[PDB]
Amino acid sequence: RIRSTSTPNVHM
Amino acid sequence: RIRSTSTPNVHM
Amino acid sequence: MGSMERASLIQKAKLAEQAERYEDMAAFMKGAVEKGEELSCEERNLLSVAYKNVVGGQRAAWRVLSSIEQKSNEKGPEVREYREKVETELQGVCDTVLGLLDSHLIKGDAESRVFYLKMKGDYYRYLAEVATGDDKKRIIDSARSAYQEAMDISKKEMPPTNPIRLGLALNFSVFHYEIANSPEEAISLAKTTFDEAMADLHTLSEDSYKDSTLIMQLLRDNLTLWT
Amino acid sequence: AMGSMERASLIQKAKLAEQAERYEDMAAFMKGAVEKGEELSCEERNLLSVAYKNVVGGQRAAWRVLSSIEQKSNEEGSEEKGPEVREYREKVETELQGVCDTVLGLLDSHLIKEAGDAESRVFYLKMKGDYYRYLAEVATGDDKKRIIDSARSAYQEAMDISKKEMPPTNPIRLGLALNFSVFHYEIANSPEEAISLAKTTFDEAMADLHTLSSYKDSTLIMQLLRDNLTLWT
Ligand SMILES: *CC(=O)NCC1CCN(S(=O)(=O)c2ccc(I)cc2)CC1
Ligand SMILES: *CC(=O)NCC1CCN(S(=O)(=O)c2ccc(I)cc2)CC1
Ligand SMILES: [Cl-]
Ligand SMILES: [Cl-]
Ligand SMILES: [Mg+2]
Ligand SMILES: [Mg+2]
Ligand SMILES: [Mg+2]
Ligand SMILES: [Mg+2]
Ligand SMILES: [Mg+2]
Ligand SMILES: [Mg+2]
């Protein structure tokens, strides 16, 4: 199974 | 400047 | 760290980031937090990026080792021992972040309050991923409680397309799906969030557009994955 | 406390750490295994090399970024900029030197003297040359001269053995010659020697290429010799 994606680790 | 290439870090 | 001036700690965090030295970057930001002044938006980005790089690496390693462990059990004590070592280090970093949040950062404006409560939720969620038994139940409750308080503030005080509000909702939906065994709530939250955000997108400032659209795409992609 | 750990357990954990991309851990496990005082196998030399080169490789990349920022700042010459980057560059530099010293310590205390065969002796002398070279990149002044000499001496001893004992297509011999040529060009300010060594190495290897199974490895290093020669001419 592919895991769900959370908020990416980038500068907002 | 481009640096010279040395031996790669791979399993030989 | 506390013998360095605050401005020097911030400068060194930025240098460490450029050098891809994220453990150092995190330690510099912890030092800056301990000076007792509020963080700016830029500084919250530095704090967030640093600790997420560190814990991100630990999570990836734990997942590899846990997979090997389970496959083996399906050849000796080594995998269990080493998985436990990595697990202990991960828990240590999560505890450090949660400590800073409780001792210094969680108190100001809605944006910062929501950001720090979201962060508390996230790091309890990372602890939940490796927890077992009764400890796991308590940890899950702590994550839920932090996320819910953040959601409550964000609904009262921020527009539906605000990128902090969106990132919080995305992460809370992941909590529901991956941690809390609640796919119905995960899907319902993500769909409601996406629709309400799109309905107000015309009011969003241009400086937030790239960020908010990125998060809305991830809501969409998860919804496709989950349905 | 790795002294009392089973050697086989340390090797197993090094392999796990590799799979988990935990290179500092991997290196520490291999140091523990070396300290058992038994000779290493081929697989174990690969584990040792990959682990420490990942660690020092990250430090080298970071040092280069910081040194560039430092020099750019200093050239601008603003009355108020520069101290923080210098201090942090120094911190990374100290850590890099520490790792290099650890590797050189293992080579001197355990690995070079205890090697049975020519192939492994050449590998370890090459490694000694490489880690002195990494020290040379960050050294200044008279220390730099001494370090450069140490690297040259290790590489030359390795070259001498490899010419007497190993085929020109052997990947250890090839990797040694490649790295010694880089030393000449990048460290010792000797482009003529760099080019001459790389060209001789490539040609002698190509002459025996028809004899190999081996082939993929040797041709990979030969291509890097070719790429450097293009860069240098
Ligand atoms: C103004 C301010 O507080 N900025 C700091 C960022 C706030 C948002 N977080 S986040 O982790 O919630 C996040 C949201 C959206 C995206 I694209 C990335 C991260 C990061 C710090
Ligand atoms: C049998 C044995 O000793 N194997 C260990 C390897 C020998 C070669 N080295 S190396 O650093 O010289 C190297 C050569 C070629 C390539 I492609 C990568 C590395 C690594 C250990
Ligand atoms: Cl362990
Ligand atoms: Cl520093
Ligand atoms: Mg002060
Ligand atoms: Mg200042
Ligand atoms: Mg103050
Ligand atoms: Mg445990
Ligand atoms: Mg100026
Ligand atoms: Mg120095």
Are residues D28 and D20 in contact, defined by beta-carbon separation less than 8 angstroms?
no
The secondary structure of residue B11, as a DSSP letter, is -
**Which residue type sits at D216?**
K
Q: Which residue's CA is the nearest one to ligand 2's atom 1?
A: D42
- Tokens read off for C35: 């000076």
Q: Where are the domains of chain D?
A: 7-232
Q: What is the DSSP string of C10-78?
A: HHHHHHHHHTT-HHHHHHHHHHHHTT-PPPPHHHHHHHHHHHHHHHHHHHHHHHHHHHHHHHHH---SH
Which residue owns the Cα nearest ligand 2 atom 19? B12
Q: CB of C64 within 8 Å of any CB in chain D?
A: yes
Residues 1 to 12 of B: which have CB under 8 A from any D CB? 2-12
Q: Count other Cβ atoms within 10 Å, centred on residue C176.
A: 22
Specify whether the CB–CB gap between D153 and D138 falls below 8 A: no
Task: Compute chain D's Rg from CA coordinates.
Answer: 19
Contacts of C206 (CB under 8 A, 6+ apart): none
Residue type, D173: R
Within 10 Å of residue C121's Cβ, how many Cβ atoms?
24
Q: Which residue of C has its CA nearest to D60?
A: C19
CATH of domain D7-232: 1.20.190.20
**C-alpha distance from residue C153 to each of C149, C187, C198, C212 (Å):** 6, 21, 20, 18
Dihedral (C-alpha) D27, D33, D38, D43: value to the nearest 10 degrees?
Answer: -60
Does ligand 2 lie within 6 Å of residue B7's CB atom? yes
Separation of CA B8 and ligand 2 centre (Å): 10
The 3-state secondary structure of D146-199 reads HHHHHHHHHHHHHHHHHHHHCCCCCHHHHHHHHHHHHHHHHHCCCHHHHHHHHH
Q: Resolution of the experimental model in angstroms, please?
A: 1.8
Among C68, C129, C139, smallest CA distance to C98 is for C139
DSSP string, C89-141: HHHHHHHHHHHHIIIII----HHHHHHHHHHHHHHHHHHHHH--HHHHHHHHH
Q: Are C66 and C84 in contact (CB under 8 A)?
A: no
Helix, strand, coil % over all residues of chain A, rounded to 5: 0, 0, 100
Dihedrals φ, ψ of C162, to 5°? Answer: -60, 130
User: Using CB atoms, which residue from C45, C48, C174 is nearest to A6?
Assistant: C174
Other CB atoms within a 10 A radius of the CB of residue C36 amount to 8
Contact D182 B8 (CB under 8 A): no
Rounded distance, CA A11 to CA A4, Å? Answer: 21
Residue type, D131: Y
> Taking Cα atoms as reference points, which of C118, C133, C132, C205 lies closest to residue C170?
C118
Alpha-carbon D80 to chain mean position: 38
Residue D46 Cα to ligand 2 middle (Å): 6
Q: Which of D194, D201, D126 is closest to D167 using CA atoms?
A: D201
Q: Which of C227, C126, C216 is nearest to C162 (CA)?
A: C216
Environment class of D115 (CB within 10 Å of its CB; exposed 0-12, middle 13-18, buried 19+): middle
* Chains B and D are touching, with contact defined as 3 or more CB–CB pairs separated by less than 8 Å: yes
What Å distances lie between residue D105 and C75, C204, C205, D25, CA to CA?
33, 60, 59, 18
Rounded CA gap, C212 and D93, in Å? 40
Cα-based torsion angle of the residue sequence C26, C12, C14, C87 in order, rounded to the nearest 10 degrees: -20
- How far, in whole angstroms, is CA C129 from its chain's centroid? 13
Say how many Å lie between the CA of residue D79 and the centre of ligand 4: 20
Q: Taking CB atoms and an 8 Å cut-off, how many pairs form between chains B and D?
A: 40
Rounded CA gap, C73 and D97, in Å?
41
Query: What's the distance, CA C68 to chain centroid?
Result: 26
Judged by CB atoms closer than 8 Å, whether chains meet at A11 and C49 is answered as yes
CA distance D177 to D193: 12
Distance from the CA of D96 to the center of ligand 4, in angstroms?
14
B neighbours by CB contacts (3+ pairs under 8 Å): D
Q: What is the DSSP letter of D108?
A: I
Q: Which mutation among D42, D45, D47, D117 tests ligand 2's pocket best, with the greatest number of atoms within 8 A of CB?
A: D45
Distance CA D66, CA D143 (A): 21
Taking contacts as CB-CB distances below 8 angstroms, the residues of chain C near D12 are 76, 78
Residue D117 is classified by DSSP as S
The amino acid occupying position A2 is I
Q: Verify whether the Cβ–Cβ distance A5 to C49 is below 8 Å.
A: no
The CA-based dihedral angle spanning residues D157, D209, B3, C19, taken in that order and rounded to the nearest 10 degrees: -90
State the method: X-ray
Cα(B8)–Cα(D154) distance, integer angstroms: 20
The listed CATH number (3.40.50.620, 3.30.750.24, 3.20.20.70, 1.20.190.20) that belongs to domain C6-226? 1.20.190.20
Contact between D180 and D196 (Cβ < 8 Å)? no
D154-160 own/partner pairs: CB under 8 Å, 24+ apart: D154/D125, D154/D126, D154/D128, D154/D129, D155/D125, D155/D126, D155/D129, D155/D179, D155/D180, D155/D183, D157/D125, D158/D122, D158/D125, D158/D126, D158/D129
Residue D33 burial (CB count, 10 A): 24
DSSP element (H, E) containing C194: helix C183-199
Dihedral angle over CA of C134, C138, C139, C141, nearest 10 = 140
Query: Identity (one letter) of the amino acid at C169?
Result: A
Of D195, D202, D228, which to mutate for an interface test with B (greatest number of B Cβ within 10 Å)?
D228
d(CA C4, CA C7): 8
Residues composing chain D: 233
Q: Which residues of B touch D184 (CB under 8 A)?
A: none
Q: How far apart are alpha carbons C171 and C120 in whole angstroms?
A: 12
